Paper text:
We then determined cryo-EM structures of the reconstituted PIC–nucleosome complex in the absence (complex A) or presence (complex B) of nucleoside triphosphates (NTPs) under the conditions of our transcription assay. For complex A we obtained a reconstruction at an overall resolution of 3.3 Å, with local resolutions of 2.9 Å for Pol II, 3.2 Å for the nucleosome and 3.7 Å for TFIIH. The transition from complex A to complex B also led to a further detachment of nucleosomal DNA from the histone octamer. In the absence of NTPs (complex A), only one turn of terminal nucleosomal DNA (SHL–7 to SHL–6) is detached from the histone octamer surface, whereas in the presence of NTPs (complex B), two turns of nucleosomal DNA are detached (SHL–7 to SHL–5). In the structure of complex A, TFIIH contacts the +1 nucleosome only via its Tfb2-Tfb5 dimerization domain. In all three PIC–nucleosome structures, we obtained an ordered conformation of the NTT of Pol II subunit Rpb6 as confirmed by crosslinking mass spectrometry. Whereas the NTT is mobile in all previous structures of Pol II complexes, Rpb6 residues 12–35 are observed here in the active center cleft of the polymerase. Structural superposition shows that the NTT would clash with DNA and RNA in an initially transcribing complex (ITC)27, indicating its position is incompatible with transcription.
Residue numbers in the entry:
A (entry chain e): 37 to 134
B (entry chain f): 23 to 102
C (entry chain h): 28 to 122
D (entry chain g): 13 to 118
E (entry chain a): 38 to 134
F (entry chain b): 21 to 102
G (entry chain c): 11 to 119
H (entry chain d): 26 to 122
Write the structure that this text describes.
DNA sequence: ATCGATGTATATATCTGACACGTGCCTGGAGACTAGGGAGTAATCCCCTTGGCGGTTAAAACGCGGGGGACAGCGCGTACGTGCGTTTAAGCGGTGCTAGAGCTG
DNA sequence: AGCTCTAGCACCGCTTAAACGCACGTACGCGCTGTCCCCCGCGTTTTAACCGCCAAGGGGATTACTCCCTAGTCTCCAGGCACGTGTCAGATATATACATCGAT
């Protein structure tokens, strides 16, 4: 039989691969479309610098990764491994965002 | 529209890998999407306003950097 | 000097305009004065920066308007900015 | 006769003192004419909202005089003024009477 | 005689101290603690009474906010008892640890 | 020289502080952990206040200096002057 | 007229003392700027830049690189506990994050 | 056409790096990052020095204001090093012209 | 259910010290005028962003088995809430006095 | 450097409420087990992100020109803050009626 990894084995390898990596983990064009539909609610006919979208992507990914460390910490605090939306809500509540 | 769904589940999974999480619940991703959207709202609600001050209608990276400086998250890498 | 500058009488006039039968404590007056000073410092700092952004050496009504739209939260700003323009209108009509 | 700038703008807060504080605070080398008027209007509007909510809280506590507890109840109950002064603590303010649902008895 | 069930008198204190607004720490022990900590930075300092007041109430507000966060992450862990790990989790998520 | 006043932050004082925080039940090591947290918080705030005091060539820590030290850490305090 | 000598060489610094004084004046922080204040500020800026640069050079040597990349700066800032405290609210572009796994996440044999 | 004389700390970071690591080069993105870092630290030191200058009703910013701002916002031990280094530079500015 | 304590919502008489109101003054705000420098406006341009087409491939979408982690249930014993006697020190009032804050030249 | 005066520190005595130590009961954190469900690994499809290249146009930067707005100066006065007064809002006492917890 072909070798099949245990559930959670290659997940740790993927964590180790992406923790040392620095490239953006969200695709450029879907995030660009998201930015341009979000900016449409504040002013029509806007334009964007490419570096502006890059800065938005960098900041959004940094914020999401930091939120993921906090939600992982409070998921471990609940004697679990899987992160739940209640863990994210707790992390945002302790951080004073809600 | 559907561009909030453009942040696909592998992208949230990769961001959780960079955050160090093995197991991700199925209700995380859309919730994460919402949180991401909310965060972007605030930054855009600043950034275009800076553009609104400049009598411009293109958003430069410099306005985004100083928009991010307002909430307390200074971003190095695009200027000072 | 010995002179203790504060916003006590102006906050008192605002309170009597809003609630004529309601008094205020001296401690609450101190909190109101510190709140006015802190909000003024915040808006003035943002206006000073927004002047520095566009190489402008002056603070106009546009600086304060954009500073209010950044700093004061949403519909409050949607009130205050509009209300501010009314004051500017009363400063331009009355000359 | 000299008429003050606050009465010109129909405001209670001092326009001239705000102009003096803007100039002496050295925020910029120049200060426009309408900027102290606008800032004083914003300040008195914010003071009006805080004082109105504090007076409502004092009437709910049937107190004629506003105490700092009424100010804390005014800022913390309003969700929209809450994040304006989220980082700010208030002298003698206390906290909202909030109890979690899990800790409540059956 | 009469004795309340354990947990209900504590709920009475939660309603009592959230309604009230004065200091919960005694003034003189906090003043002595402030004098102990401040002597590490300069010997023979002096403190205004209002300085001790401001230090005490700011510390009280910080500790009550920390207790809010600690109780929230305690009930997140399906517990009604706050534990030290709740406090380190709260201070870690807040960014001060 | 004062010594061992951190125990002046007593057992029921920490209990009362938790009651205002909405805490129903309290563990035993909570008292020691909160004493440590209060100690480090006062160390930071008092260090900043003394640093402000030394710049004014003063030897009494003014409440105004404590207010600005708390403002520098993001915890703005009202009611003692602005 | 005497030979034009920069204030940085007089102070013994690489950072520009005169530019710091000019930006202090143009930043309008106060109506008067002292003589030694730009010298002190240039020295502090040079020291902080030197600290993070030598930590990033050590990080680049550990990764066996002769060019300092933003990943090296991220590793230099975050591995030092005290520079991390200085920049706890700062995100570095293309910096990534520290490789850190919590203790319970590791599998057991 | 005409271009604004773009202002940055590019060469000085390079000289400091060559002082501490002569062999090691550095990318342009790290020039942007380090320039942003030094600009941010300059802004916070200058703002804090102006803030203390306003607090003592002093119209000037001397080396004492900068030193106290460094002791305030910079975290502990390197602060003393920075302070010492700053003091050394001041001495080298006073012994010379 | 049930009653008894037990904390809680609504009507009047008394005191106090903290706040509302009145007096004085003096200094900062207001009226007037000018320069000149900074802000507003018109014309250019070029580069920087937007839009579009081919392709093609890595990544996203989807199906599906499974196993391991989430979650519910139960036993325990111990740690923590609650009560009472004791004592310990906080709190308050009063005295004194001097280091040092604050103001001025 | 000098003068003033003020509040911060030190000590002392009385009182009384808070803290502390101990007894005691039981509520809950934790450990263990059973279940089941739903997320992960991986194979197969598919799709659109991205790279490359090109057109275009328009908008931010650049310059010159103008003009009018605000810092600056001078002079005068009335409004805002030290100080004094007085008076009443709230705390405290009683009395009367209501919703809640415990133990049976």
């Amino acid at each position: 039989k072909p070798h099949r990894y245990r559930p959670g084995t290659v997940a740790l390898r993927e964590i180790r691969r992406y923790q040392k990596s620095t490239e953006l983990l969200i695709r450029k064009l879907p995030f660009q479309r998201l930015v341009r539909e979000i900016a449409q609610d504040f002013k029509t006919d806007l334009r964007f610098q490419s570096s502006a979208v890059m800065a938005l992507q960098e900041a959004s990914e940094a914020y999401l990764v930091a939120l993921f460390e906090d939600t992982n910490l409070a998921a471990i605090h609940a004697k679990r491994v899987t992160i739940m939306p209640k863990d994210i809500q707790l992390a945002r509540r302790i951080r004073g965002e809600r | 529209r559907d561009n909030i769904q453009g942040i696909t589940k592998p992208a949230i999974r990769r961001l959780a890998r960079r955050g160090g999480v093995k197991r991700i619940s199925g209700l995380i991703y859309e919730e994460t999407r919402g949180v991401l959207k909310v965060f972007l709202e605030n930054v855009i609600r600043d950034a275009v306003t800076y553009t609104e001050h400049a009598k411009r209608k293109t958003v430069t990276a410099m306005d985004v950097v100083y928009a991010l400086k307002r909430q307390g998250r200074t971003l190095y890498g695009f200027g000072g | 000097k010995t002179r203790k500058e504060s916003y006590a009488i102006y906050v008192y006039k605002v309170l009597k305009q809003v609630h004529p039968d309601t008094g205020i404590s001296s401690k609450a007056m101190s909190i109101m004065n510190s709140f006015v000073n802190d909000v003024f410092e915040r808006i003035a700092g943002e206006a000073s920066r927004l002047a520095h952004y566009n190489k402008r050496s002056t603070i106009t009504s546009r600086e304060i308007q954009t500073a209010v739209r950044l700093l004061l939260p949403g519909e409050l700003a949607k009130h205050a900015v509009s209300e501010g323009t009314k004051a500017v209108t009363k400063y331009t009509s009355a000359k | 006769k000299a008429k003050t700038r606050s009465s010109r703008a129909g405001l209670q807060f001092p326009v001239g003192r705000v102009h003096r504080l803007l100039r002496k605070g050295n925020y910029a080398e120049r200060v426009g004419a309408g900027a102290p008027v606008y800032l004083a209007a914003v300040l008195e509007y914010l003071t009006a909202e805080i004082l109105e909510l504090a007076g409502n809280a004092a009437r709910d506590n049937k107190k004629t005089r506003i105490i700092p507890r009424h100010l804390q109840l005014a800022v913390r109950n309003d969700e929209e003024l809450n994040k304006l002064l989220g980082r700010v603590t208030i002298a003698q303010g206390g906290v909202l009477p909030n109890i979690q649902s899990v800790l409540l008895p059956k």
